[PDB]
Scaffold this motif. Structure first.
Motif, PDB file in Angstrom:
ATOM      1  N   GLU A 249      -8.417 -13.841   7.670  1.00 55.30           N
ATOM      2  CA  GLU A 249      -8.653 -13.197   6.390  1.00 55.30           C
ATOM      3  C   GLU A 249      -9.083 -11.754   6.564  1.00 55.30           C
ATOM      4  O   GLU A 249      -9.658 -11.379   7.595  1.00 55.30           O
ATOM      5  N   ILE A 250      -8.815 -10.961   5.531  1.00 51.32           N
ATOM      6  CA  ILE A 250      -9.314  -9.608   5.459  1.00 51.32           C
ATOM      7  C   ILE A 250     -10.369  -9.561   4.363  1.00 51.32           C
ATOM      8  O   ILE A 250     -10.296 -10.289   3.376  1.00 51.32           O
ATOM      9  N   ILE A 251     -11.374  -8.722   4.572  1.00 49.61           N
ATOM     10  CA  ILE A 251     -12.343  -8.399   3.539  1.00 49.61           C
ATOM     11  C   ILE A 251     -12.186  -6.913   3.322  1.00 49.61           C
ATOM     12  O   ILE A 251     -12.431  -6.126   4.236  1.00 49.61           O
TER      13      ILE A 251
ATOM     14  N   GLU B 131      -1.053   3.082   9.682  1.00 47.77           N
ATOM     15  CA  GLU B 131      -2.146   2.584  10.526  1.00 47.77           C
ATOM     16  C   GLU B 131      -2.765   1.353   9.871  1.00 47.77           C
ATOM     17  O   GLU B 131      -2.915   0.317  10.510  1.00 47.77           O
ATOM     18  N   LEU B 132      -3.096   1.456   8.586  1.00 52.82           N
ATOM     19  CA  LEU B 132      -3.774   0.360   7.898  1.00 52.82           C
ATOM     20  C   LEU B 132      -2.903  -0.878   7.830  1.00 52.82           C
ATOM     21  O   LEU B 132      -3.380  -1.968   8.104  1.00 52.82           O
ATOM     22  N   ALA B 133      -1.636  -0.712   7.468  1.00 51.20           N
ATOM     23  CA  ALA B 133      -0.680  -1.842   7.430  1.00 51.20           C
ATOM     24  C   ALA B 133      -0.643  -2.588   8.773  1.00 51.20           C
ATOM     25  O   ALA B 133      -0.676  -3.806   8.818  1.00 51.20           O
ATOM     26  N   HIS B 134      -0.570  -1.834   9.859  1.00 48.74           N
ATOM     27  CA  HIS B 134      -0.561  -2.402  11.195  1.00 48.74           C
ATOM     28  C   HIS B 134      -1.804  -3.244  11.445  1.00 48.74           C
ATOM     29  O   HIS B 134      -1.716  -4.323  12.037  1.00 48.74           O
TER      30      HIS B 134
ATOM     31  N   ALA C  79      -7.261 -13.538  -5.148  1.00 52.19           N
ATOM     32  CA  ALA C  79      -8.500 -12.969  -4.601  1.00 52.19           C
ATOM     33  C   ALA C  79      -9.137 -11.914  -5.522  1.00 52.19           C
ATOM     34  O   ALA C  79     -10.358 -11.715  -5.481  1.00 52.19           O
ATOM     35  N   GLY C  80      -8.318 -11.223  -6.320  1.00 59.60           N
ATOM     36  CA  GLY C  80      -8.809 -10.187  -7.244  1.00 59.60           C
ATOM     37  C   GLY C  80      -8.382  -8.742  -6.945  1.00 59.60           C
ATOM     38  O   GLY C  80      -8.733  -7.832  -7.683  1.00 59.60           O
ATOM     39  N   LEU C  81      -7.611  -8.509  -5.886  1.00 58.35           N
ATOM     40  CA  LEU C  81      -7.058  -7.173  -5.643  1.00 58.35           C
ATOM     41  C   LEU C  81      -6.152  -6.763  -6.809  1.00 58.35           C
ATOM     42  O   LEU C  81      -5.567  -7.607  -7.476  1.00 58.35           O
ATOM     43  N   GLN C  82      -6.069  -5.472  -7.076  1.00 57.44           N
ATOM     44  CA  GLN C  82      -5.185  -4.987  -8.115  1.00 57.44           C
ATOM     45  C   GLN C  82      -4.698  -3.594  -7.780  1.00 57.44           C
ATOM     46  O   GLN C  82      -5.297  -2.890  -6.976  1.00 57.44           O
ATOM     47  N   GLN C  83      -3.588  -3.220  -8.405  1.00 58.19           N
ATOM     48  CA  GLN C  83      -2.975  -1.930  -8.164  1.00 58.19           C
ATOM     49  C   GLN C  83      -3.941  -0.800  -8.518  1.00 58.19           C
ATOM     50  O   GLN C  83      -4.796  -0.968  -9.391  1.00 58.19           O
ATOM     51  N   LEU C  84      -3.777   0.338  -7.830  1.00 61.46           N
ATOM     52  CA  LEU C  84      -4.649   1.524  -7.940  1.00 61.46           C
ATOM     53  C   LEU C  84      -5.963   1.389  -7.178  1.00 61.46           C
ATOM     54  O   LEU C  84      -6.701   2.374  -7.044  1.00 61.46           O
ATOM     55  N   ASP C  85      -6.273   0.198  -6.674  1.00 60.25           N
ATOM     56  CA  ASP C  85      -7.461   0.046  -5.838  1.00 60.25           C
ATOM     57  C   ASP C  85      -7.366   0.975  -4.623  1.00 60.25           C
ATOM     58  O   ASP C  85      -6.382   0.939  -3.889  1.00 60.25           O
ATOM     59  N   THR C  86      -8.383   1.800  -4.412  1.00 63.67           N
ATOM     60  CA  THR C  86      -8.418   2.678  -3.237  1.00 63.67           C
ATOM     61  C   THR C  86      -9.240   1.969  -2.168  1.00 63.67           C
ATOM     62  O   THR C  86     -10.299   1.436  -2.457  1.00 63.67           O
ATOM     63  N   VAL C  87      -8.728   1.964  -0.941  1.00 65.16           N
ATOM     64  CA  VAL C  87      -9.284   1.177   0.147  1.00 65.16           C
ATOM     65  C   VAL C  87     -10.255   2.012   0.973  1.00 65.16           C
ATOM     66  O   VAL C  87      -9.893   3.043   1.551  1.00 65.16           O
ATOM     67  N   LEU C  88     -11.499   1.548   1.027  1.00 68.99           N
ATOM     68  CA  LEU C  88     -12.565   2.249   1.719  1.00 68.99           C
ATOM     69  C   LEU C  88     -12.891   1.605   3.051  1.00 68.99           C
ATOM     70  O   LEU C  88     -13.236   2.297   4.002  1.00 68.99           O
ATOM     71  N   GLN C  89     -12.789   0.281   3.113  1.00 73.88           N
ATOM     72  CA  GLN C  89     -13.175  -0.496   4.291  1.00 73.88           C
ATOM     73  C   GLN C  89     -12.290  -1.726   4.459  1.00 73.88           C
ATOM     74  O   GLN C  89     -11.929  -2.395   3.473  1.00 73.88           O
TER      75      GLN C  89
ATOM     76  N   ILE D 297       0.817  -1.223   0.000  1.00 73.82           N
ATOM     77  CA  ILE D 297       0.000   0.000   0.000  1.00 73.82           C
ATOM     78  C   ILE D 297       0.858   1.284   0.000  1.00 73.82           C
ATOM     79  O   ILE D 297       2.059   1.251   0.248  1.00 73.82           O
ATOM     80  N   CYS D 298       0.214   2.400  -0.304  1.00 72.13           N
ATOM     81  CA  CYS D 298       0.833   3.725  -0.294  1.00 72.13           C
ATOM     82  C   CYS D 298      -0.249   4.767  -0.061  1.00 72.13           C
ATOM     83  O   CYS D 298      -1.440   4.466  -0.203  1.00 72.13           O
ATOM     84  N   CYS D 299       0.177   5.974   0.312  1.00 73.52           N
ATOM     85  CA  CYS D 299      -0.698   7.135   0.573  1.00 73.52           C
ATOM     86  C   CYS D 299      -1.497   7.038   1.861  1.00 73.52           C
ATOM     87  O   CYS D 299      -1.695   5.956   2.388  1.00 73.52           O
ATOM     88  N   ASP D 300      -1.946   8.206   2.336  1.00 81.05           N
ATOM     89  CA  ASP D 300      -2.807   8.341   3.490  1.00 81.05           C
ATOM     90  C   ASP D 300      -4.160   8.961   3.099  1.00 81.05           C
ATOM     91  O   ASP D 300      -4.213   9.861   2.256  1.00 81.05           O
ATOM     92  N   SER D 301      -5.232   8.493   3.741  1.00 81.86           N
ATOM     93  CA  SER D 301      -6.518   9.194   3.749  1.00 81.86           C
ATOM     94  C   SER D 301      -7.079   9.562   2.363  1.00 81.86           C
ATOM     95  O   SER D 301      -7.218  10.746   2.049  1.00 81.86           O
ATOM     96  N   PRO D 302      -7.418   8.561   1.533  1.00 76.57           N
ATOM     97  CA  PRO D 302      -7.343   7.118   1.717  1.00 76.57           C
ATOM     98  C   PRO D 302      -6.048   6.462   1.255  1.00 76.57           C
ATOM     99  O   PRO D 302      -5.225   7.057   0.560  1.00 76.57           O
TER     100      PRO D 302
END
Length: 82
Positions: free
Chosen positions: A73-75, A62-65, A39-49, A19-24
């Motif tokens: 598993e993570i969803i 924070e998110l990495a931690h 699973a289907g994750l791909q680059q440029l995906d912005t993480v909302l939840q 991952i990279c960037c903050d908020s989001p």
């Protein structure tokens, strides 16, 4: 510009993405043949939840931690350009 829910079980060495960037936070990359890619994750995906918790709003570190602290598993709900 859509929403995908991606369910990634924990593998041998974590979940196989960066991952990279903050908020989001954004997905930097996905390891070839790792948990996240297939699973289907791909680059440029912005993480909302992450699991039950909205994370629009969280820093990268924070998110990495939190990701590394999930047992099984993570969803992730992501926003992507399609």
């Amino acid at each position: 510009m859509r929403y995908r829910q991606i369910t990634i079980p924990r593998g041998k060495d974590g979940f196989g993405f960066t991952i990279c960037c903050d908020s989001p936070v954004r997905v930097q990359a996905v390891d070839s043949g790792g948990p996240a890619e297939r699973a289907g994750l791909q680059q440029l995906d912005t993480v909302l939840q992450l699991n039950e918790r909205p994370v629009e709003h969280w820093k990268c570190v924070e998110l990495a931690h939190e990701i590394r602290s999930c047992p099984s598993e993570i969803i992730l709900l992501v926003w992507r350009m399609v």
